[PDB]
Write a protein that binds this ligand. Structure first.
Ligand SMILES: CC(C)Oc1ccccc1-c1c(C(N)=O)[nH]c2cc(F)c(Cl)cc12
Ligand SMILES: [Mn+2]
Ligand SMILES: [Mn+2]
Length: 366
């Protein structure tokens, strides 16, 4: 079976034996002393420990192949003039088909972020949003896929005006540096310092104005757990805990021509159940129904209001506010730097395998 144009064939139909293409395989970097961690590539004790978890790595790879094919399709049609809703719905329709959506066993890990200009993250349109992608916009496309809760958190920046080319180059280089410096036993603060050092070495000129590129200090990389986008460990992107064997990380960096700090701005669109809250009995009818719709369709994965609308849900705002006030669901509003500033992002998911570091979401694009 061969892939169609536009893509419509599920990834598990292109690889029916269940063996999915590997991502970029990398040798582990040497420790702070000077001694290499490379021995793992040939360690028979690590080879057995890596082959035992083959099913897990394989689930990540199916989700990363769906991610690669979706984003290549998006890059062929994403154009100024389209509404943000049209872009998100078209990407998500393709994503559901290629991942072969199946309740909580396979699907979309989180809503399609399409944050514009000074807004760096967590903007997706709610219904009625008339926002249109502009020729001069700097759009961060951040979407996720999953197979059995193995999440691919991977993102890129879209532009149509070549004036942002050096800002894009700075963020791509800083993300690639964070990826190279990652490895088993490496301290998280050292990955951050290396990212910042590369990012700040760039100066850019946009519309007659100049800036030294700044990392967004309150945004960061993070460990990923099963059905848990952020498993608790933080990979700073500026200058105590160490990366461990078997862990999975989202290595992301954000560069800004503003203050390099993000604040909560605009209306909220992204929501996600608190992973640590157990069962809470609810009598309020609309609130109880919405919590049941959330547990059924999303569980601990993130969602957006547009995804409640497509399920036939209506009059849920107060019920959603109640779940938020109770601490059962947390809101994740858009995170924006100062007005007039520009932000860019590049993100990859990496597997800290016993034998090698796998940049599972790597493609021929980024
Ligand atoms: C930047 C910060 C506010 O993000 C988080 C903080 C804690 C836990 C999770 C996330 C998060 C991330 C991510 N850290 O990459 N991506 C997300 C997609 C979503 F749809 C939602 Cl609701 C949540 C997340
Ligand atoms: Mn992301
Ligand atoms: Mn992330």
């Amino acid at each position: 079976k061969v892939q169609t144009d536009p893509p419509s064939v599920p990834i598990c139909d292109l690889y029916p034996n269940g063996v999915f293409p590997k991502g970029q395989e990398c040798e582990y970097p040497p420790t702070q002393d000077g001694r290499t961690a490379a021995w793992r590539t040939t360690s028979e004790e690590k080879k057995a420990l890596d082959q035992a978890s083959e099913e897990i790595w394989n689930d990540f790879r199916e989700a990363a192949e769906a991610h690669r094919q979706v984003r290549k399709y998006v890059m062929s049609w994403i154009k100024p003039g389209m509404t943000m809703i049209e872009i998100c719905e078209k990407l998500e329709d393709c994503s559901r088909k290629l991942i072969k959506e199946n309740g909580l066993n396979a699907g979309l890990a989180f809503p399609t972020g399409c944050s514009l200009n000074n807004c760096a993250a967590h903007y997706t349109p709610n219904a009625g949003d008339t926002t249109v992608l502009q020729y001069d916009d700097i759009c961060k496309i951040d979407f996720g896929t999953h197979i059995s809760g193995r999440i691919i958190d991977c993102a890129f920046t879209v532009t149509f005006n070549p004036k942002y080319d050096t800002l894009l180059k700075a963020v791509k280089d800083a993300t690639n540096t964070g990826i190279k410096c990652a490895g088993i036993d490496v301290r998280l603060c050292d990955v951050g310092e290396a990212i910042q050092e590369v990012m700040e070495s760039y100066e850019v000129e946009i519309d007659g104005k100049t800036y030294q590129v700044k990392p967004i200090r309150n945004l960061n990389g993070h460990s990923i757990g099963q059905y848990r986008i952020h498993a608790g460990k933080t990979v700073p992107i500026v200058k105590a805990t160490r990366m461990e064997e078997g862990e999975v990380y989202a290595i992301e960096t954000f560069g800004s021509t503003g203050k390099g700090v993000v604040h909560d701005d605009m209306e909220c669109s992204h929501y996600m159940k608190n992973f640590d809250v157990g069962h809470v009995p609810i009598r309020l009818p609309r609130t109880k129904h919405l919590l049941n719709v959330i547990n059924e369709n999303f569980g601990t994965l993130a969602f957006c209001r547009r995804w409640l609308d497509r399920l036939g849900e209506s009059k849920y705002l107060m019920a959603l506010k109640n779940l938020c006030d109770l601490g059962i669901v947390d809101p994740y509003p858009p995170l924006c730097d100062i007005k007039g500033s520009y932000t860019a992002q590049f993100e990859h998911t990496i597997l800290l395998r016993p034998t090698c570091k796998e940049v599972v979401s790597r493609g021929d694009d980024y």
